[PDB]
Design a protein around this ligand. Structure first.
Ligand code: HEM
Ligand SMILES: [Mg+2]
Length: 301
């Protein structure tokens, strides 16, 4: 009588991922059988490739999740708002598929199985292939992940809903950033470090009273009476060297509130100041999704 989390939320250090964002074209009932087929395919791929340490998540947008759930649970779920009156655009879609493992080839086969399961009931809007870069660096050259929740126990505490109808579920936020590395390279390495809030090569935290309030860490390291608003990030670099490249931002949280507070801070809604990373990179997509527990994907129908 308990709930099982979807396999793609908790895994750490996965070197590769595939994110598919899509709109529902047909009847919402088509997503019920397709989701059951896909979670079945993920279990089949895990049995065939045990050393891939494969995980996947199927998550739903506000409109379609209210229909599938009959309005029960997922109290915080809503369409992703525009933050900063436009600084963070909104591209809310109906379905999110997140696949992650140690092997891109296996993720690609799993992505093909997801497309075969949903078929022509969906319209694919985005497909991004994430890759861990050297020293787990973001393409800017700064290490991405140091203060991210560590170990299964703390990651469950931060990302997984504990009780009630949504037990085992999680809220997902996805946002694709396009880096302008030419604009970053014009900045001196000390100016870049003040923009992030950590040193570049050694990845040391700059003290809060020594770094600007617009620094990335000052915008997102938020506390409410000493309790941090933590999230489980699964972001990865993406793109081509000569074309579009940047960071595909992805985060899971048991409460959508923690993610929203960080976005209100970053995009100027809380105190009128915005994230210094906006001098070289910009978000171009944005969406909120609800990832139900595994047994509630089996109860669809
Ligand atoms: C271009 C996009 C982004 C880049 C390159 C980026 C990069 C980084 C870097 C380098 C760190 C420091 C090392 C660490 O992980 O602890 C960091 C920390 C963090 N970022 Fe971001 N980030 C981006 C977007 C976001 C967004 C959109 C959110 C949330 C809405 C976010 C939330 C966080 C959190 C919570 C931390 C850890 C803060 C702490 O407690 O020390 N980031 N990010
Ligand atoms: Mg801290």
């Amino acid at each position: 009588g308990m709930s099982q989390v979807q396999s793609g939320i908790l895994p750490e250090h996965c070197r590769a991922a595939i994110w598919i964002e899509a709109n529902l074209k047909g009847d919402v009932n088509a997503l019920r059988e397709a989701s059951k087929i896909f979670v079945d395919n993920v279990a089949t791929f895990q049995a065939k490739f045990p050393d891939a340490k494969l995980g996947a998540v199927v998550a739903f947008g506000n409109n379609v999740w209210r229909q599938l759930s009959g309005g029960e649970g997922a109290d915080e779920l809503k369409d992703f708002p525009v933050y900063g009156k436009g600084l963070a655009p909104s591209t809310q879609y109906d379905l999110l598929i997140h696949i992650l493992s140690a092997r891109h080839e296996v993720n690609f086969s799993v992505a093909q199985a997801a497309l075969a399961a949903f078929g022509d009931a969906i319209d694919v809007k985005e497909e991004i292939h994430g890759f861990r870069w050297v020293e787990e660096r973001d393409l800017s050259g700064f290490v991405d992940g140091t203060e991210n929740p560590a170990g299964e126990e703390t990651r469950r505490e931060v990302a997984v809903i504990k009780d009630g109808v949504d037990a085992g579920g999680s809220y997902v936020f996805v946002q694709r950033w396009e880096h302008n590395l030419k604009q970053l390279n014009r900045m001196s390495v000390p100016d870049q470090e003040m923009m992030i809030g950590r040193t570049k090569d050694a990845n040391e935290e700059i003290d809060g009273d020594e770094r600007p309030v617009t620094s990335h860490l000052s915008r997102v390291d938020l506390k409410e009476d000493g309790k941090g608003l933590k999230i489980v990030r699964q972001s990865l670099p993406y793109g081509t060297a000569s074309g579009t490249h940047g960071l595909y931002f992805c985060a899971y949280c048991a409460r959508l509130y923690n993610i929203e507070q960080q976005l209100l801070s970053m995009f100027g809604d809380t105190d009128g100041k915005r994230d210094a990373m906006l001098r070289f990179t910009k978000p171009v997509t944005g969406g909120y999704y609800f990832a139900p527990s595994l047994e509630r994907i089996q109860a669809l129908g």
